[PDB]
Design a protein around this nucleic acid. Structure first.
Ligand code: SAH
Ligand code: SAH
Lengths: 188, 283, 283, 187
DNA sequence: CATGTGGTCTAATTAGACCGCATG
DNA sequence: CATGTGGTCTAATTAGACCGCATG
């Protein structure tokens, strides 16, 4: 593993939601950084692999389905497919191995068939992070990721998504970023 | 020296790919096809004597399947254009319904694509309609990282068929010239006693309204003074398929025109596959 | 010294007689057919390059028509049996319904018979079913002044087809034998990957239930594990017709099966027509 | 025509119906002759050409369909077809020219379709003979024949045949009459 | 403005179930 | 007793009329 003094500041690529205001709270980004180790782009329809390669090497690639209700001229599958495309654009050369990670989180926007195409294109089953308060679940997310980061049934989640049509649960996923401290440098 | 070609066929239908490779002399070692319509599978299994291996639904094939069944030299594909063509009003787009199946093709292509250190020859082709919204075309291009070439079959057949082809085959943008065996006019494809009121016909869909040309919907054939529509054999001749190629599985004109309307033009795919005779072994 | 043959075919249907004569190599100078079903006429017109003349209903043919079109060397006939066969519970007999059409044959036959001074050879043949009422067979023999020869097509094909043949052709009672090309078992007529449950098939008619053999109505072919009916090409193989001989006029499965269930058995009529090569000019 | 002393008694073959007691009442056959030079067979189902040729050469063949009270074991067309089949047997050879005649009469039991079939097989149109009493038709018949022998529309005949469902030999005897110039006249 | 690897709806159209009994 | 160049009736099955608008 990498020692503490050789840990470099992580270079991340946020694809739909901006985690800068949240990652700066975990000491992965400095509050003031004109270099901007995070690259954020929201409409990736006109992005070519050369754009991703020119923006610079990335250690982490993050994507998220828009929170429930906050949709706009795009289906939920669009975000998953575009995330897959850009992640393939950013993944480093296999002959030059390096610490590389990625993550895609859904706020119960994808249905069952979208869940299956997500698990197929990302090659793993998601984990369900709940927010239990007062013995009752209030929100939940699904996470696909290659980082080595309470149980409830699918029926409770379905009724939760049914009722909660009437918001970002970043707090639940934050913990999943903690294991990245060992590979990259930790700001105060 | 040269080795036989290993093909992976995607949404194969009536196996036009294998037919072109065979008519071209290219020796085929493997032809793995993904198809779900039992009529098309019967067409392929009978007209090629069970030389094609079928793998069923595209959404159930994994990277393990690609590695084991592999390696592959050629990948053909043409996804369903039900939610992509601008003739369907209820069309859902590339990210909803049939269009989503394109991303399966993509998913397998990068699976079968050689790695950055392997300099093996590897070829691919994807086809779809021109009559789609520009957004679908640009997104397909983005995912394939390639811009298409538009080919109309009217240069080589007796019918219009403007289709977009993405791929890396040699000379995909080379000028298209007609062969002496190509039936350019409708009369060259008709039967005895039948007369063509037209010299070229429009695009043939899976529906009957396409067989009646013009804004007034006129009949194309005259026989014994009466106005008649095209026969199945004449459709096969127009598309470039051999005669009675679709005469299987007790199919009527409906299923046959359906299977032929979703298919490719044999001369166009012959043109696009022609350079492969220089890379692979020839019978 | 031999000359081309001049034929008159009443109720020609799929024009089997011309096919048999041209397969035996006999040069035909004139072949006049009397058929009403437009699809039969289409089969005969397309598959034989319009070398056949059609003259519409037999009831509108006059003796003056016979003299103008004549003289004739061969008369061929097979009248509708829907009112003669016993499979029909509402059969009307030989003197009602379609049975009366037999007497048109008779009529034209007497119009085409040469004068007794004419030693010119004159041949004629009439075909009908075995499963007719004994009175009808008796009366057909009475009007034709000769007894019929019974022939079953199982000796030369893969299906049962018991038929009575009246006529004066040379050696109509000689034993029937199967040539090498005679597909004797059902498996010889099947397509790729399809296997036959039976070695021989029951009598095939225009109706679909004839394909379901046995009192249990068992399917005759299996494929990929599941039972299936016979295909149109396999039916064409069973009757001895060339493959896709009835693939005209955008005909569905039912029309093809009707056409083939009314027609004759090609090898039987080849057996019956073989002697004519000794009297008429061969190619 | 033939001189009277060389005229011979006519050999006739009556089918389905019997013209005896009518032609004999005209003078073509003598009443005493037991053979009678007349052949009559009602069921012609199993009759072969050799039977007709053995039954003697015939100068006239006659057939009639049974009236509205038919035997009704056979369709009306059976009589016509069998008449044709037997007349083709009874005709003389072309090299044997001889006065030969035939006649078929329908008592309104044939349908227009069967009428067309009859006119096709007998090679001529029939002649409708009417029985007019009190300016009102009572019965009528249609005749086909080659013997060189009052107008009514087919609607009168249609309503007639429709009503009378609940044998006009007299009308036809006149058609036989011209056969005197060829055969012997018996007193 | 002509066009189009189509879906919906409904009127024809078709096909499977049912029936049928005279003869080797 | 099994079978058959079928006809009828009804339930599916199919096919033609209708509609549709974004791109050259
Ligand atoms: N999920 C799926 N997996 C595999 N094949 C599929 C599929 N969904 C549809 N298909 C098949 O994809 C085909 C698309 S039509 C293209 C046919 C081909 N271009 C040719 O020339 O024949 C159809 O035949 C359809 O049956
Ligand atoms: N009035 C008529 N005139 C001429 N042909 C007729 C007819 N009525 C029926 N037909 C035809 O007579 C045929 C009898 S079926 C026998 C077909 C023929 N023997 C063969 O081997 O193909 C049918 O095809 C029917 O269409």
């Amino acid at each position: 593993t990498v020692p503490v003094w050789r840990r470099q500041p992580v270079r991340v690529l946020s694809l739909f939601e901006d985690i800068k205001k949240e990652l700066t709270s975990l000491g992965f980004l400095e509050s003031g950084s004109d270099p901007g180790q995070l690259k954020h782009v929201v409409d990736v329809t006109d992005t070519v692999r050369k754009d991703v390669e020119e923006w610079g090497p990335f250690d982490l690639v993050y994507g998220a389905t828009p929170p429930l209700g906050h949709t706009c001229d795009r289906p939920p599958s669009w975000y998953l497919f575009q995330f897959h495309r850009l992640l393939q654009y950013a993944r480093p050369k296999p002959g030059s191995p390096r610490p590389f990670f990625w993550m895609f989180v859904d706020n119960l926007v994808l249905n069952k068939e979208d869940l299956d195409v997500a698990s197929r294109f990302l090659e793993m089953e998601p984990v369900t992070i709940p927010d239990v308060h007062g013995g009752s679940l209030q929100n939940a997310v699904r996470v696909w990721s290659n980082i080595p980061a309470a149980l409830v049934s699918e029926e409770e989640l379905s009724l939760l998504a049914q009722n909660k049509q009437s918001k970002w649960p970043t707090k639940l996923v934050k913990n999943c970023f903690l294991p990245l401290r060992e590979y990259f440098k930790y700001f105060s | 020296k040269r080795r036989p070609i290993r093909v992976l066929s995607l949404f194969d239908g009536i196996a036009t790919g294998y037919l072109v490779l065979k008519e071209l002399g290219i020796k085929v070692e493997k032809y793995i096809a993904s198809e779900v319509c039992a009529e098309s599978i019967a067409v392929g299994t009978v007209k090629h004597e069970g030389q094609i291996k079928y793998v069923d639904d595209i959404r159930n094939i994994t990277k393990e399947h690609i590695d084991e069944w592999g390696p592959f030299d050629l990948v053909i594909g043409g996804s369903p254009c039900n939610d992509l063509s601008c003739v369907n009003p209820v069309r859902k787009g590339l990210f909803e319904g049939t269009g989503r199946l394109f991303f399966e093709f993509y998913r397998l292509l990068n699976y079968s694509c050689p790695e950055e250190e392997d300099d093996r020859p590897f070829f691919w082709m994807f086809e779809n309609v021109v009559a789609m919204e520009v957004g679908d075309k640009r997104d397909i291009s983005r995912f394939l990282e390639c811009n298409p070439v538009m080919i109309d079959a009217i240069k080589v057949s007796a019918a219009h068929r403007a289709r977009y082809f993405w791929g890396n085959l040699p000379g995909m943008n080379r000028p298209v010239m007609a062969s002496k065996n190509d039936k350019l006019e409708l009369q060259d494809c008709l039967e005895f006693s039948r007369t063509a009121k037209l010299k070229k016909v429009q695009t043939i869909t899976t529906k009957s309204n396409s067989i009646r040309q013009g804004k007034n919907q006129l009949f194309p054939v005259v026989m014994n003074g009466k106005d008649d529509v095209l026969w199945c054999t004449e459709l096969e001749r127009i598309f470039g398929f051999p005669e009675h190629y679709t005469d299987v599985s007790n199919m009527g004109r409906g299923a046959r025109q359906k299977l032929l309307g979703r298919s490719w033009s044999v001369p166009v795919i012959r043109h696009l596959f022609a350079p492969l005779k220089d890379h692979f072994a020839c019978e």
